[PDB]
Design a protein around this ligand. Sequence first.
Ligand code: FMN
Ligand code: FMN
Ligand code: SNU
Lengths: 306, 306
Amino acid sequence: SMSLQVNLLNNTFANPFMNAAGVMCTTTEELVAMTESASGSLVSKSCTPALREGNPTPRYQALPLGSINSMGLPNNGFDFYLAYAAEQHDYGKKPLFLSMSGLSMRENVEMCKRLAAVATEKGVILELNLSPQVAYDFDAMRQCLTAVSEVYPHSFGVKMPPYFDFAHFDAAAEILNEFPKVQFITCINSIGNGLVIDAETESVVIKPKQGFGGLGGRYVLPTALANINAFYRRCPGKLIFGCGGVYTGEDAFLHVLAGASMVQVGTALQEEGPSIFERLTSELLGVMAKKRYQTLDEFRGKVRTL
Amino acid sequence: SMSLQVNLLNNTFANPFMNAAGVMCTTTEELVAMTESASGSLVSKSCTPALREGNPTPRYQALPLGSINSMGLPNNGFDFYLAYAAEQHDYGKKPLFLSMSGLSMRENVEMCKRLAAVATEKGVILELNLSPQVAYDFDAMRQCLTAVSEVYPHSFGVKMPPYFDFAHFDAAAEILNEFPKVQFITCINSIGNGLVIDAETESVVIKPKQGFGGLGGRYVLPTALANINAFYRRCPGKLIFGCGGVYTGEDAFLHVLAGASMVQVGTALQEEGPSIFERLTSELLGVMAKKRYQTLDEFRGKVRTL
Ligand SMILES: Cc1cc2nc3c(=O)[nH]c(=O)nc-3n(C[C@H](O)[C@H](O)[C@H](O)COP(=O)(O)O)c2cc1C
Ligand SMILES: Cc1cc2nc3c(=O)[nH]c(=O)nc-3n(C[C@H](O)[C@H](O)[C@H](O)COP(=O)(O)O)c2cc1C
Ligand SMILES: Nc1ccc(-n2cccc2)cc1
């Protein structure tokens, strides 16, 4: 007998799967659909203090090997996600993460001051989006985490952009290890500022920023696994949430091998809808059955080096 | 009717194709094979002052979507590549680039001082490998460009790692634009420190650095196009050489669209051998024929934004 059960931050999760922040989690209908899905959890769209329209369309393109987007943080604003967490979310069904992406330190501080009460009362968990972007400015990242830690009397996690250098893994891990309240690290946000060109149209495929946008899906899996494993190794006091290139139970298996506790699904969820969670749980159980694993703890972070 | 001809750096190239530094360019036989190939040019393996055995094997793995490697600069040493450039290379067949990757500023300075006379006499062109790794440290990058510019009385190019943030494109371009001897930028080196995990073996697939290695091939094409275009726009005084994810004439077409003058081939060449250049010239001409382009000048850098 087998279990996808994950236990972290005083919560039980039926399975490690959840949406990636920003994918099918902006509207009430999406948040309800994610709650009604077979997902172990869900995270609300990264919120700003006030609603944002986001970037001009097209701002997302599905690709053979994943996706490119420059959404520009279209979101209903903090009040809307706070209200969802405070009064609508069925915590009996699954735990809720709220993604926060203040455009300044003050914005994160003011939102966290108000989130604190709802975290206490309802158990919503903050995923603070740090993804130059804050996570690529080590001083700015420490300052942000200091400001948030000062005012937010709860465990939270950080959504990280990918790093590509051991010096950056070390520098980032050193900063995150200064903050015991950072109990999880979500690796990774998009591979930033890719440029998809359609050979047929001789054009870019998204409107904002001259066609430059975050890569998701198959493009990002080895980068995601690298970041998951790098932080799994350097932040042993923290859990890692995997995000990047999950289409199958086998991909999820790789995330967990690399060190992932929770496994977030972005591009694949965008393309398939929340029914994907029934397939992914089924496929991960099938991979574990074939490999004679009963629990995720048996192979989490146990990727073999040569 | 049609021409792949490229005119740059006081040279004529039959076509824009060449090997990526470090692929099929370490040994005499490889350099001869590249010279005898249909490629418009070639670049010698990134060299250190002395022979290096490189990292323990396995250190390269071909993947469905590209490759991962941690070669560790296995090379015959600077004297070997200088002797090839000085005494053996048939400049009547095609121009030659020499890739240099000193492990310190001092190493680059000493090799550049000796390269100077061979560049003068024979016309070999330096590709200085800046790919934390030097180009991710803007101070180290400025240092090595200052040192090389001070001692090296010729134009040269720089092999750049990919950036993922406009702040980094701007910072890198600002530095490169301060060095008029930098006449070409090769975008990109590998996407650094990916981690490929084999679901079957539950292991990494290369031995060095716990399985972390540079990604090439399909994985890197949108990142390569982004870097090519970003530097094409921000360094209007300089040529861009494309490198990353070229398997087909169509991929090469995308590089040139993005702003590439020369198109380097790594992973695809590693898998196919130098015969690939006959296929790539044929395919790029076929793409141009179907699109009614006669010359690369007609569409270089002309990618359409929305
Ligand atoms: C349409 C879309 C919107 C996204 N919005 C957010 C966001 O609001 N917050 C966030 O942290 N990441 C956001 N991301 C990044 C994803 O959460 C995820 O890190 C990335 O897509 C990689 O996962 P994937 O390979 O499964 O797509 C978004 C990605 C997509 C495709
Ligand atoms: C086996 C191997 C060795 C490489 N050695 C070098 C090197 O010596 N110097 C260098 O600048 N880049 C080196 N690279 C990076 C390639 O030049 C190229 O930037 C990268 O592979 C991306 O191109 P691709 O997608 O065509 O493989 C190497 C890549 C591979 C796969
Ligand atoms: N100073 C700095 C920080 C992060 C990077 N980076 C490289 C790849 C992604 C981030 C580069 C330079």
